[PDB]
């Protein structure tokens, strides 16, 4: 199944090579901001990112070994977490700001334009500062993102089971990869397991941000004032 036969270095190269591009928003700086437009920019961006994400997922070792219905479930569960960790990664070198896109760099005050957004912005910024302090590496980031894809929906899945098993084998594989990376970075064994823990614990916060974010999306949806794309709708409905 290749995935399980991959060396740590081959896993890393595979993940790096499958990285989606950094997309641009439609942000027109001449246009006065409204809560409806900012949310529109965000949704439009996320919608186009989703297409790349879906095709990125197929390139994550082990993912295409899963049944199609499992693939669907995992992405339905993890899509926002994955968008978010991507956003946080992009924003590492922009303290106090979120780089949604190269032409869309927002700070805290600008989140106020959408009620309830500021709390989300603050959580995303805190995560970004966390990565910056830990000096998260690109190699570690792609491992974390792949872990989210495989892990977030693994406990909401008869006789099947063997699907769960394979997923955990791949997950363990990725753990081996993270350790391999840290060992090469010169970290002691104590440091390795400390950093591994630190990294995975951040995944808890990312889940939290996704949950809360989904809550706002699911609500403003019923508000209808801001239109979601057909893909985001089906993704959103999956959480209800």
């Amino acid at each position: 199944s290749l995935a399980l036969s991959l060396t740590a270095d081959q896993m890393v190269s595979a993940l790096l090579d499958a990285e989606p591009p950094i997309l641009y928003s439609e942000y027109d700086p001449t246009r006065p901001f409204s809560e409806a437009s900012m949310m529109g920019l965000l949704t439009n961006l996320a919608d186009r990112e989703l297409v790349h994400m879906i095709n990125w997922a197929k390139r994550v070792p082990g993912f295409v070994d899963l049944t199609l219905h499992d693939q669907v479930h995992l992405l339905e569960c993890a899509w926002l977490e994955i968008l978010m960790i991507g956003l946080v990664w992009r924003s590492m070198e922009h303290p106090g700001k979120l780089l949604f896109a190269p032409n869309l760099l927002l700070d805290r005050n600008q989140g106020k334009c959408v009620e309830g957004m500021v709390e989300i912005f603050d959580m995303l910024l805190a995560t970004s500062s966390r990565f910056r302090m830990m000096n998260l590496q690109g190699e570690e980031f792609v491992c974390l993102k792949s872990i989210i894809l495989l892990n977030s929906g693994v406990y909401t899945f008869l006789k099947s089971l063997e699907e769960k098993d394979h997923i955990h084998r791949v997950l363990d594989k990725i753990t081996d990869t993270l350790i391999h990376l840290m060992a090469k970075a010169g970290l002691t064994l104590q440091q390795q397991h400390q950093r591994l823990a630190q990294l995975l614990l951040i995944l808890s916060h990312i889940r939290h941000m996704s949950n809360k974010g989904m809550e706002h999306l699911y609500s403003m949806k019923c508000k209808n004032v801001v239109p979601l794309s057909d893909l985001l709708l089906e993704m959103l409905d999956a959480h209800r």
């Binding site: 297409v51 879906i54 997922a57 197929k58 199609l68 693939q71 669907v72 992405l75 339905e76 057909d230 893909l231 089906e234 993704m235």
Partner: peptide, 10 residues
């Protein structure tokens, strides 16, 4: 039938 489903096929 789902969009995600369809896209995952292609």
């Amino acid at each position: 039938h789902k969009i995600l489903h369809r896209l995952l096929q292609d």
